[PDB]
């Protein structure tokens, strides 16, 4: 064993890249499916409560990745990858969970959208500050600032598509829901099977128990910290729970796309497999916590 | 910000355990790999061997199994590639390179590495 991935084969890499970019397009269009400008004006009056959730999820996510990296003294590059993992919008799935259980979707979607179009703002600065903290900031000259911004703007293009679509005929979202479900299911299964077959040996390099423990705890920890903070600021139970679970689940697609495009494939290697395990684990744990809550309200 | 430098002058046919030593000067931090390379005329650089400076795990490319090695000199800030006596074939310019990247596997790709010494030219 202890062999480097049998790399050099481009067509599989390109298939990975193209499916990832198209899922980025479709998910950010699904963001554009939601109308918010009407709520933007109304919520500008008292956004302080909303802004608290925003700054909380912007702050906790990096520091959590930082502290879990430190506590497991994780090697530098995968700790950096985890840092990328913590910082991502992750709103569609959260919206789905909340709609499944309860809540006013109007808030969840607007926090998601503003998280997106402020991520390009705070993303680079948080990367810059917390890169220095790994040991001395060894990656300082490897962070692709402008390339990250390019990835971000390509992500943001479907946001522009959706927002201008609001100005035009909103009827198009009547068919939008179907297609969205089919494309998300197909892309999920496709990435699973392709990222499995394309590299087999390196998966064992990507399955270290430390990675499993982090990918499990840190989203759960995000849930807990959102819960406790929203309890601290006297917010209602429903808003507290919504913001908690919105924090708990991130954007695997954005992180994966940044990992593949911003850094060399051999640099990321099977560590690219981490966000998939992440995402499936938040799916499982979110369902479990939904069931646990429905048990709690009973008794 | 690490400066590299090499020392090798073995130009002989098979039967020479050629002393190769790559003195390293710089921030010898943790978790940085360091490797050795090739330049035969007209073909690009390609990986041969490497080792994490911190843990000490080494790897060997296919051509060098049983034929090369690498040794850490961490107290004196040196790396020690003793290539075993090799056929007249392997005549090539060799290099040194190291990345601060720390990972379980061995990074192999040409373009990844950053710090380059004045790699020695040796024939066999």
Author numbering:
A (entry chain A): 12 to 310
B (entry chain B): 1 to 124
The authors write:
Here we present cryo-electron microscopy structures of human NTCP in complexes with nanobodies, revealing key conformations of its transport cycle. NTCPEM adopts an SLC10 fold with two structurally distinct domains—core and panel —and contains nine transmembrane α-helices (TM1–9) with an unstructured N terminus on the extracellular side.
This yielded final cryo-EM maps of NTCPEM–Nb87 in nanodiscs, and NTCPEM–megabody (Mb)91 in detergent at overall resolutions of 3.7 and 3.3 Å, respectively, enabling structure determination. In complex with Nb87, NTCPEM adopts an inward-facing state with core and panel domains tightly packing against each other on the extracellular side of the membrane. On the intracellular side, the domains separate, uncovering an amphiphilic large cavity (molecular surface volume > 1,500 Å3) that opens to the cytoplasm, as well as laterally to the hydrophobic core of the membrane through a crevice between TM6 and TM9. On the other side of the transporter, TM1 and TM5 pack against the core domain, occluding the cavity from the membrane. Na1 and Na2 face this cavity and localize behind the conserved X motif. In addition, the cavity is lined by several conserved polar residues from the core domain (including N103, N262, Q264 and Q293), some of which have been shown to be important for transport; hydrophobic residues are mostly located in the panel domain. Nb87- and Nb91-overlapping epitopes on the surface of the core domain distant from HBV/HDV binding determinants strongly indicate that the inhibitory effect of Nb87 on myr-preS148–GFP binding is not owing to direct steric hindrance, but rather to stabilization of the inward-facing state that allosterically buries myr-preS1 binding determinants in the protein core.
